[PDB]
UniProtKB/Swiss-Prot annotation, chain B:
It comes from Saccharomyces cerevisiae (strain ATCC 204508 / S288c) (Baker's yeast). The chain holds residues 34 to 145 of 311 of the full protein. This is ATP synthase subunit gamma, mitochondrial. It is found in: Mitochondrion; Mitochondrion inner membrane. Mitochondrial membrane ATP synthase (F(1)F(0) ATP synthase or Complex V) produces ATP from ADP in the presence of a proton gradient across the membrane which is generated by electron transport complexes of the respiratory chain. F-type ATPases consist of two structural domains, F(1) - containing the extramembraneous catalytic core, and F(0) - containing the membrane proton channel, linked together by a central stalk and a peripheral stalk. During catalysis, ATP synthesis in the catalytic domain of F(1) is coupled via a rotary mechanism of the central stalk subunits to proton translocation. The gene is ATP3. F-type ATPases have 2 components, CF(1) - the catalytic core - and CF(0) - the membrane proton channel. CF(1) has five subunits: alpha(3), beta(3), gamma(1), delta(1), epsilon(1). CF(0) has three main subunits: a, b and c.
From Swiss-Prot, chain C:
The gene is ATP15. Keywords: ATP synthesis, CF(1), Hydrogen ion transport, Ion transport, Membrane, Mitochondrion, Mitochondrion inner membrane, Phosphoprotein, Transport. Belongs to the eukaryotic ATPase epsilon family. The modification Phosphothreonine is found at T51. It comes from Saccharomyces cerevisiae (strain ATCC 204508 / S288c) (Baker's yeast). This is ATP synthase subunit epsilon, mitochondrial. PANTHER family: ATP SYNTHASE EPSILON CHAIN, MITOCHONDRIAL (PTHR12448), ATP SYNTHASE SUBUNIT EPSILON, MITOCHONDRIAL (PTHR12448:SF0). InterPro entries: ATP_synth_F1_esu_mt (IPR006721), ATP_synth_F1_esu_sf_mt (IPR036742). One of its GO terms (cellular component) is mitochondrion. Gene3D superfamilies: ATP synthase, F1 complex, epsilon subunit superfamily, mitochondrial.
Swiss-Prot record, chain D:
The keyword Ion transport applies. Belongs to the ATPase epsilon chain family. F-type ATPases have 2 components, CF(1) - the catalytic core - and CF(0) - the membrane proton channel. CF(1) has five subunits: alpha(3), beta(3), gamma(1), delta(1), epsilon(1). CF(0) has three main subunits: a, b and c. GO terms for cellular component: mitochondrial inner membrane; mitochondrion; proton-transporting ATP synthase complex. It is found in: Mitochondrion; Mitochondrion inner membrane. This is ATP synthase subunit delta, mitochondrial. Mitochondrial membrane ATP synthase (F(1)F(0) ATP synthase or Complex V) produces ATP from ADP in the presence of a proton gradient across the membrane which is generated by electron transport complexes of the respiratory chain. F-type ATPases consist of two structural domains, F(1) - containing the extramembraneous catalytic core, and F(0) - containing the membrane proton channel, linked together by a central stalk and a peripheral stalk. During catalysis, ATP turnover in the catalytic domain of F(1) is coupled via a rotary mechanism of the central stalk subunits to proton translocation. The chain holds residues 29 to 160 of 160 of the full protein. It comes from Saccharomyces cerevisiae (strain ATCC 204508 / S288c) (Baker's yeast). The keyword Transport applies. GO terms for biological process: proton motive force-driven ATP synthesis.
Swiss-Prot record, chain F:
This is ATP synthase subunit beta, mitochondrial. Belongs to the ATPase alpha/beta chains family. Mitochondrial membrane ATP synthase (F(1)F(0) ATP synthase or Complex V) produces ATP from ADP in the presence of a proton gradient across the membrane which is generated by electron transport complexes of the respiratory chain. F-type ATPases consist of two structural domains, F(1) - containing the extramembraneous catalytic core, and F(0) - containing the membrane proton channel, linked together by a central stalk and a peripheral stalk. During catalysis, ATP synthesis in the catalytic domain of F(1) is coupled via a rotary mechanism of the central stalk subunits to proton translocation. F-type ATPases have 2 components, CF(1) - the catalytic core - and CF(0) - the membrane proton channel. CF(1) has five subunits: alpha(3), beta(3), gamma(1), delta(1), epsilon(1). CF(0) has three main subunits: a, b and c. Present with 164000 molecules/cell in log phase SD medium. It is found in: Mitochondrion; Mitochondrion inner membrane. Coiled coil: none annotated. It comes from the Eukaryota.
């Protein structure tokens, strides 16, 4: 916290808490399904699977595998983006729109693209 | 990842496979039981809703909402589906009373 | 006689009739299904506006 | 049409469902009403009594614990009630009187018990007609 | 393997094969061998039990899990076989025990059903009554042969 | 049986069977919960956790560890106490009033003490 700032440290701690909650709940999801959770933890699992597909990033060197040009997202936009998804500002966005994206602005834009396509 | 950890988890998940298979069979037996009650409700309810079809009783213009779910769990996507239908209907009338039947 | 005024509602009126016909059953043919029809175990808890509670009463 | 479509329904098993029938006899609040082929559309609450179903065959006699008789305007009569009954087997006076005196004793208790007690008194004294 | 020597199979195969059943030409003498293998933690994958099972004529496979149910001697009939089997039994016990193998092989398929409600037909609860009571028969106290 | 008496041997057998059936039911309850059992099954699970935590005991050496004076229980009380809890004479008492307790006398005393 005294090296990268308190906000950055708190965001990183919340993200590792959500993903650790997912990795702990992995087995019950594998056996029964997502329907047998609580109602806080089901939201936790859903936001975790948002954040996993949001961790993807189209590389400037792996451009020929995915067909997407490169994305160089700076630090502060990433901090604010994860803070926004942690605070619950986007919980109704479909999960696939988080996938293979730059920042949260491109998440909104790509969700709008898939909104205009699926309609 | 020892041999002992993997063998213990394999034994526990073979127990889970056998127990879920038994639970599927027992639930199928109770389902073949309760089809009788479903038919005896529906063939009787026709004999009173057919009146409401012919006597067209369409209402117009503080509401009661009653839901029928289980006391137990473990049936999958029922316990949140009907809650979500309550939510859609309930944002329209937020002052309406609710009597739930089921834990 | 004034059960609509003093006692039960009409569905409960015919329910008491159902328990009376099931109570005056033939003890040869009073099967387990009819005794299943008279197995009342439901509990009701009148919640209040502040999500308060009463004790669960056997209806 | 000639005849009538009868639909007799109980919460555990509907006995008749769309059967063609000639005469039914059933106890309503206005008295004992027989319904034949065509009829006025009429909703009759059913006091617990006896229902007799006559067809091209004979007339089967049931004790009935109450419900609703409803004449759908295409002359389809439905009966929606609770309890069925055989010829005479399901009722015995040893279970009737020995419980009936206890029920009259419950009729002097507090109000909710005494009302249901008086209801069961009336039902057993209706069953006296089945004792016949 | 597991630091045993090479020819240790040639140890045990030289031992257990000394038991036999001689002909009427030799005098019909007979030696019958019951060795005992102390396994480790519920295993037949270890090297010595693999070798002895490859020699001998089956198992009277005993378990701790069946012992703590009180079934004494805890004989796991779902695994315990004998390839000689119904060739060398008393005919009296043979002509009634021939279904008993079938009843217990049925009962071990179903006995997970015995820990639930009454939601079964008679076609399974019959076999459960048979299975519980026949398994209860195989209890006996120690040092009491019949 | 012919050394410790048939009473003691049968009590040991019933305790051993109860704990075994508990250990086998621990596969069901870890996913399905308690709601799937029978009545005799839920009775057996409750009795088994009773007999399990009844084997807890404070120690005169380990008094520095638990802060509790050492309960030393003789045999003849112990056999009859297990006979009672196997027969179900103390099913009404909750679980936590059995932990770190000596004989059945201190069982009933802690059961009354934890009412408040």
């Amino acid at each position: 916290a005294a090296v990268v700032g308190q906000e950055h440290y708190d965001v990183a701690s919340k993200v590792q808490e959500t993903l650790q909650t997912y990795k702990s709940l992995q087995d019950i999801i594998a056996i029964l399904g997502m329907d047998e959770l609580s109602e806080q933890d089901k939201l936790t699992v859903e936001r975790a699977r948002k954040i996993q597909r949001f961790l993807s990033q189209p590389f400037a060197v792996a451009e020929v595998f995915t067909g997407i040009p490169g994305k160089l997202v700076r630090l502060k936009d990433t901090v604010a983006s994860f803070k926004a998804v942690l605070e619950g500002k986007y919980d109704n966005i479909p999960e696939h729109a988080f996938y293979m994206v730059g920042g949260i602005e491109d998440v909104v834009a790509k969700a709008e693209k898939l909104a205009a396509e699926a309609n | 990842a020892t041999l002992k950890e993997v063998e213990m988890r394999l034994k526990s998940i073979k127990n889970i496979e056998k127990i879920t298979k038994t639970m599927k069979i027992v639930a199928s037996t109770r389902l073949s039981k309760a089809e009788k009650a479903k038919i005896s409700a529906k063939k009787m309810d026709e004999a009173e809703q057919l009146f409401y079809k012919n006597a067209e009783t369409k209402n117009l213009d503080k509401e009661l909402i009653v839901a029928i779910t289980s006391d137990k769990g473990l049936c999958g996507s029922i316990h949140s589906q009907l809650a979500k239908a309550v939510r859609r209907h309930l944002n329209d009338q937020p002052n309406a009373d609710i009597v739930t039947i089921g834990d | 006689s004034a059960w609509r005024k003093a006692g039960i509602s009409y569905a409960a009126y015919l329910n008491v009739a159902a328990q009376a016909i099931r109570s005056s059953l033939k003890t040869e043919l009073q099967t387990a299904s009819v005794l299943n029809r008279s197995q009342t175990d439901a509990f009701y808890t009148q919640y209040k506006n502040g999500t308060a509670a009463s004790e669960p009463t056997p209806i | 049409s000639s005849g009538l479509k009868l639909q007799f329904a109980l919460p555990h098993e509907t006995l008749y469902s769309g059967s063609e029938v000639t005469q039914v006899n059933l106890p309503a609040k206005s008295g004992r009403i027989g319904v034949l082929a065509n009829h006025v559309p009429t909703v009759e609450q059913l006091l617990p009594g006896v229902v007799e179903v006559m067809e091209g065959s004979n007339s089967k006699k049931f004790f009935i614990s109450g419900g609703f008789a409803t004449v759908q305007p295409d002359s389809q009569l439905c009966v929606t009630a609770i309890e069925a009954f055989p010829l005479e087997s399901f009722s015995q006076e040893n279970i009737k009187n020995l419980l009936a005196e206890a029920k009259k004793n419950v009729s002097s208790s507090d109000a909710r018990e005494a009302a249901e007690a008086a209801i069961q008194v009336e039902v057993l004294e209706n069953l006296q007609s089945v004792l016949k | 393997r597991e630091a045993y020597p090479g020819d240790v199979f040639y140890l045990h195969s030289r031992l257990l094969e000394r038991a036999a059943k001689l002909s009427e030409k030799e005098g019909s003498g007979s030696l019958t061998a019951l060795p005992v293998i102390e396994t480790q933690g519920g295993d037949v994958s270890a090297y010595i039990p693999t070798n002895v099972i490859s020699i001998t004529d089956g198992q009277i496979f005993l378990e701790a899990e069946l012992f703590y149910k009180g079934i004494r001697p805890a004989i796991n009939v779902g695994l315990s076989v004998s390839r000689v089997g119904s060739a060398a039994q008393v005919k009296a016990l043979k002509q009634v025990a021939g279904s008993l193998k079938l009843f217990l092989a049925q009962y071990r398929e179903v006995a997970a059903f015995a820990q639930f409600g009454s939601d079964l037909d008679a076609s399974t609860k019959q076999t459960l009554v048979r299975g519980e009571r026949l398994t209860q028969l195989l209890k006996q106290n120690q040092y009491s042969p019949l």
